[PDB]
Amino acid sequence: FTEQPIDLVPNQPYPNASFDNFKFVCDNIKFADDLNQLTGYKKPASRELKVTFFPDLNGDVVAIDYKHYTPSFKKGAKLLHKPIVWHVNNATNKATYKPNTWCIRCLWSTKPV
């Protein structure tokens, strides 16, 4: 056994969405800056969303391997409530781009606006 991400469900950004000026932070700073490149984060960040790689879910965002992507996750996904982002070999490529743009808008704090 190697723990597969089993509790993946579709997620979707909310209509009337607002981009919170938040930043990604992660020990793989190359992965965080590639994700921050898709958000528009300007210094200083209002908050930091620590990104951890699955199965490590101690960060506010879990990074799932793109091998587990299904068309059901086209607008985003969440692994039991910690919003997710896709990665191939712990990095962003041209396959993860389009699904990750949706995953980033799922993080938009139009909730507490």
Curated annotation (Swiss-Prot):
Signal peptide: none annotated. It is found in: Host endoplasmic reticulum membrane. Inhibited in vitro by GRL-0617. It comes from Severe acute respiratory syndrome coronavirus 2. The chain holds residues 1907 to 2019 of 7096 of the full protein. This is Papain-like protease nsp3. It catalyses: Thiol-dependent hydrolysis of ester, thioester, amide, peptide and isopeptide bonds formed by the C-terminal Gly of ubiquitin (a 76-residue protein attached to proteins as an intracellular targeting signal). It comes from the Viruses. It is a multi-pass membrane protein. May form homohexamers. Interacts with N protein. Residues 5-113 form the Nucleic acid-binding domain. Responsible for the cleavages located at the N-terminus of the replicase polyprotein. Participates together with nsp4 in the assembly of virally-induced cytoplasmic double-membrane vesicles necessary for viral replication. Antagonizes innate immune induction of type I interferon by blocking the phosphorylation, dimerization and subsequent nuclear translocation of host IRF3. Also prevents host NF-kappa-B signaling. In addition, PL-PRO possesses a deubiquitinating/deISGylating activity and processes both 'Lys-48'- and 'Lys-63'-linked polyubiquitin chains from cellular substrates.
